[PDB]
């Protein structure tokens, strides 16, 4: 039967008119995760609870409910039950959830539980906030000028997996069609050629850009930059930038600046003029290094979103502590972007940064920005105090070595 | 008639058994270029001549022959003659050539002369050497650890231009075929969707990788890294990495290291063991920032090659002085990667770095590494001495402002 105990205290989050109605004692489902998830998750629960307790002084509390997926789901439900259907039901019903790293049933098992969750719950948006935390060792000279939020389209693009192996009957048939029926003259070597498809629709583009702007308004951000390689790939990447600008005008009353393509959207809550602009992907990669302060919310397609995220994390030295979320229309799933690392499982050694920052994304997503602000403040303070875990410690001279749990306490101490 | 005067002294470069037979007084065709090309080219000719004169002490000399393309071609041949056929003949016949920036006959003219040259001469390889020059203002902490050579496939990939506009009869027909005939279930929104094709052939991959390794052997480099996003795009990007590794084994006698995918190719001239390895594109972008010294020759597809090049130039602060070459089977065309900037045309103001470094690529391509070494040495010295042009000067405190021509002389002075 259901082995999930719904808390006695707590009320669930409602979705009405596109907005979330979050009660003072919301029930938030959580997946501990496999491997080191057993270490990082407990730290996360403690940090979030303190943030809430401190910011709202007892007037709010979260009723954590544990759901299952992965290795733990097996010891709770059966054997081959890696992703119990009721787990999906609970994430959709409760709207927001947070998960630790998951282990793929390697060999003859369900390929990556993460892709299963993302696809079944139609989590079309990959959100990757990237900012520098004072003290984190970085490779660039001025990482503190970086504070962006990447909105990566997660359901289309070349990542869609629509391809055919070179020399296969399929690949041959597709090439035949393209060259004969379509009159394609641009395929240099039609023999021993693999083919890939890159789709980009109006809806897929609009729904992502919409959220980007919504986010900027909701969080009082300065701008949304549509990143694309539209100069080359006109009908996909270029179409992306076109639909994006079109949406801002039509839905957000964007007004042209100097007649130029750039628009300005007035934030109806603060009066701030959010600038809607665009930069070519290859030029953007240079821009994030030369003029990071010029960018804020970034909206782009799958591939571009993936590359930019990894490149940014590296600049601010936050690869090991990169937060992330997969958001759809009915629910949002916050996660630890790192692996399971079964070697350190139970050792209370690993860095809880990723999942803790993912929790701040969750709190912010819930409107609880005060609490979210405390997590950022604590993180910065703890790292700046050089009271860090092994991974950071080994890269810092004069650092005090703390355990995963102790780092959690250090974050709480600097709130 | 032909308005190109073939020098009286000089002999042309021969191509035999894949190698070039370069005489001591080769005739090298050159395109001055439009706009500032009138400033930068003369500086280039002077720097190269000194490099040759100094390294070989009068035993070698280049017989520069001016050919035409662009604005200047008009005042020499007619009106609509932007790319005279005889110019193509001369580049192919003389094997190596160097050009300054070109101006596109905007409006109703031949779209980008550069793409015309590249496509007609089948210059399938875009070569972008990226290294730091002591003194150049950089955004990263340790740019001096960067010294890579990007081998970008230039004839295939998504850049091929094979796409159809959303909602057009064409786009609809292609989608119909894919979903009905191919059984494609992965196109989320088949309506109002633009489609792009990403082809990757064995030959296109092999010919590029071959050159990469040839280059590494010829220049005694340490490794060739096959960059790809093969984990996602298996039949194109993954196929690229597979064919690449296959070629190293078969043609270069690559031996497996620890049974791992990495191979080792022995340089038949130095005995050095050139490592053939691979990294995923998104991970590589992080690697160039965290461990730049681990990389050397890079071999990748069109898009990846474009992104990585721009990202690297930014790191070493060499965007304004980025050298580049388009190489094919019959000829190689070295060029200034910057624009025409008609505003500064004639003012002897702009930076001649790009084309000068492109010349060193040319000399190195000719086997004249001693002379090439002098151009690198001079450049470093001049920049390190802070005797630079306006663009660098404005970014350097205590810099001596030099004119385009004077910078040329400064390079010569530090050889």
């Amino acid at each position: 039967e259901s082995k999930v105990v719904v808390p006695a205290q707590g009320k669930k989050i409602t979705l009405q008119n596109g907005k979330l109605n979050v009660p003072e004692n919301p029930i938030i489902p959580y997946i501990e995760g496999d491997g080191i998830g057993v270490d990082v998750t407990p730290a996360m629960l403690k940090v979030v609870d303190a943030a809430v307790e401190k910011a709202y002084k007892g007037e709010r509390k979260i009723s954590w409910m544990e759901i299952y997926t992965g290795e733990k789901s097996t010891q709770v439900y059966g054997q081959d039950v890696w992703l119990p259907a009721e787990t999906l039901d609970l994430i959709r019903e409760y709207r927001v959830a947070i998960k630790g790293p998951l282990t793929t049933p390697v060999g003859g098992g369900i390929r990556s539980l993460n892709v299963a969750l993302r696809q079944e719950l139609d989590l079309y948006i990959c959100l990757r906030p990237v900012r520098y935390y004072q003290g984190t060792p970085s490779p660039v000279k001025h990482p503190e000028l970086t504070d962006m939020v990447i909105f990566r389209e997660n359901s289309e693009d070349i990542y869609a997996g629509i391809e055919w192996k070179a020399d296969s009957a399929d690949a041959e048939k597709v090439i035949k069609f393209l060259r004969e029926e379509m009159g394609v003259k641009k395929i240099r070597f039609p023999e021993h050629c693999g083919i890939g498809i890159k789709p980009c629709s109006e809806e897929g583009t609009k729904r992502l850009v919409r959220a980007a702007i919504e986010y900027a308004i909701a969080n009082d951000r300065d701008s949304v930059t549509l990143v694309h390689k539209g100069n080359i790939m006109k009908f996909t990447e270029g179409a992306f930038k076109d639909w994006g600008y079109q949406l801002a005008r039509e839905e957000f009353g964007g007004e042209l600046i100097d007649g130029g393509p750039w628009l300005k959207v007035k934030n109806p809550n603060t009066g701030k003029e959010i600038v809607i602009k665009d930069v070519i992907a290859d030029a953007f990669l240079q821009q994030i290094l030369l003029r990071p302060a010029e960018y804020d919310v970034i909206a782009c397609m799958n591939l571009n979103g993936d590359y930019i995220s990894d490149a940014l994390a590296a600049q601010v030295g936050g690869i090991g502590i990169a937060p992330g979320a997969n958001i759809g229309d009915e629910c949002a799933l916050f996660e630890a972007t790192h692996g399971t690392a079964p070697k350190y499982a139970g050792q209370d050694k690993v860095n809880p940064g990723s999942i803790i920052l993912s929790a701040e994304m969750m709190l912010r997503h819930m409107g609880w920005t005060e609490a979210a602000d405390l997590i950022v403040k604590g993180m910065e303070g703890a790292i700046n105090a050089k009271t860090v875990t092994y991974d950071f410690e080994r890269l810092m001279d004069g650092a005090k070595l703390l355990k995963c749990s102790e780092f959690g306490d250090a974050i709480i101490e600097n709130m």
Side-chain angles (χ1 to χ4, degrees), chain A residues 2-8 10-15 18-79 81-265 267-342 344-415:
Chain A
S2 182
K3 205 160 186 177
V4 173
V5 189
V6 177
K11 187 184 174 303
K12 76 185 182 188
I13 296 172
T14 305
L15 189 276
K19 300 184 178 187
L20 291 178
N21 171 29
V22 182
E24 299 190 328
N25 184 202
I27 296 174
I28 306 300
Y30 80 92
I31 297 173
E32 179 190 88
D34 302 329
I36 58 177
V38 71
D39 304 293
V40 298
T41 296
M44 180 276 283
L45 303 187
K46 193 174 184 177
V47 171
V48 176
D49 279 349
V52 177
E53 170 65 23
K54 179 180 166 60
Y56 312 121
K57 295 137 191 179
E59 283 313 302
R60 293 185 190 171
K61 182 175 183 176
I62 294 176
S63 301
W64 299 105
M65 175 179 74
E66 180 176 16
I67 54 178
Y68 305 95
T69 306
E71 199 75 59
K72 194 163 190 171
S73 189
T74 287
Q75 69 191 277
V76 174
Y77 291 126
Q79 281 187 171
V81 53
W82 290 82
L83 180 56
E86 64 124 279
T87 286
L88 295 173
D89 295 342
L90 291 175
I91 295 181
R92 308 164 110 128
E93 183 182 358
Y94 290 83
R95 308 299 180 176
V96 298
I98 189 165
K99 64 175 174 70
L102 286 177
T103 301
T104 178
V106 73
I110 173 181
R111 66 162 205 200
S112 215
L113 295 169
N114 291 7
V115 74
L117 292 161
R118 165 239 163 303
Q119 293 181 170
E120 289 197 83
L121 304 174
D122 200 35
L123 306 174
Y124 61 94
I125 303 169
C126 189
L127 177 54
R128 295 293 248 275
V130 174
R131 56 153 280 162
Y132 178 71
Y133 289 81
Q134 295 307 144
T136 308
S138 153
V140 302
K141 289 177 183 174
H142 298 297
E144 69 286 334
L145 298 179
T146 302
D147 194 339
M148 302 180 219
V149 176
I150 314 296
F151 266 82
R152 166 186 170 200
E153 200 288 325
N154 212 13
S155 59
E156 297 179 320
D157 205 3
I158 194 67
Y159 279 28
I162 310 173
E163 49 179 1
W164 298 278
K165 182 176 174 57
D167 291 317
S168 70
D170 288 313
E172 300 306 319
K173 192 178 172 197
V174 183
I175 300 172
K176 177 187 178 64
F177 169 82
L178 294 180
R179 310 209 301 146
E180 290 160 48
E181 292 299 296
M182 296 299 102
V184 175
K185 244 73 180 188
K186 291 177 152 185
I187 301 178
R188 187 72 192 77
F189 306 109
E191 286 182 2
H192 321 282
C193 187
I195 295 298
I197 313 301
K198 176 203 181 74
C200 183
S201 72
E202 180 179 29
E203 209 174 324
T205 300
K206 298 291 181 71
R207 64 179 183 170
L208 175 80
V209 185
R210 187 173 298 124
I213 300 172
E214 299 274 44
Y215 184 92
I217 292 174
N219 300 287
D220 198 26
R221 305 297 282 183
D222 309 323
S223 51
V224 173
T225 308
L226 300 169
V227 181
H228 56 100
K229 195 60 215 281
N231 54 328
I232 303 299
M233 298 161 268
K234 305 171 179 178
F235 304 143
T236 45
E237 297 268 332
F240 179 87
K241 146 254 195 175
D242 284 345
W243 289 320
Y245 268 131
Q246 180 174 44
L247 184 105
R249 309 179 312 221
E250 302 178 345
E251 283 190 36
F252 299 90
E255 291 154 37
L256 292 168
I257 304 178
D258 183 67
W262 294 11
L263 305 172
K264 53 176 181 172
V265 178
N267 183 334
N269 313 308
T270 56
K272 182 177 297 184
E273 303 261 52
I274 306 170
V275 180
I276 305 299
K277 48 181 182 169
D278 72 300
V279 291
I280 314 288
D282 61 327
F284 185 63
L285 289 168
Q286 307 190 302
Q287 287 308 112
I288 54 186
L289 265 163
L290 309 173
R291 297 178 181 172
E294 295 292 298
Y295 305 94
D296 201 332
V297 176
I298 311 299
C300 47
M301 296 173 71
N302 216 326
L303 185 142
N304 283 344
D306 183 34
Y307 288 15
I308 298 169
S309 288
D310 293 351
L312 285 171
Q315 290 174 41
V316 300
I319 297 176
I321 61 167
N326 291 279
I327 307 180
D329 286 313
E330 68 176 328
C331 53
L333 187 58
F334 302 79
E335 58 181 38
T337 64
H338 59 62
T340 40
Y344 299 125
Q347 291 185 55
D348 187 41
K349 179 178 191 168
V350 300
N351 195 331
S354 177
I355 196 166
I356 288 180
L357 293 180
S358 287
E360 86 87 56
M361 281 179 74
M362 184 177 69
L363 291 176
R364 200 164 298 280
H365 176 92
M366 288 170 62
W368 299 12
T369 57
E370 289 84 9
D373 288 345
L374 294 181
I375 291 182
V376 175
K377 183 183 176 184
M379 260 291 265
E380 286 216 281
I383 299 177
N384 192 239
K386 283 200 287 183
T387 43
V388 297
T389 44
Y390 86 110
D391 58 298
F392 272 9
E393 192 273 324
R394 61 183 230 82
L395 303 170
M396 303 170 103
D397 288 278
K400 174 183 170 188
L401 176 58
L402 294 182
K403 303 176 72 194
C404 171
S405 56
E406 299 174 0
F407 188 51
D409 288 332
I411 291 173
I412 294 176
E413 252 195 274
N414 289 259
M415 284 184 178

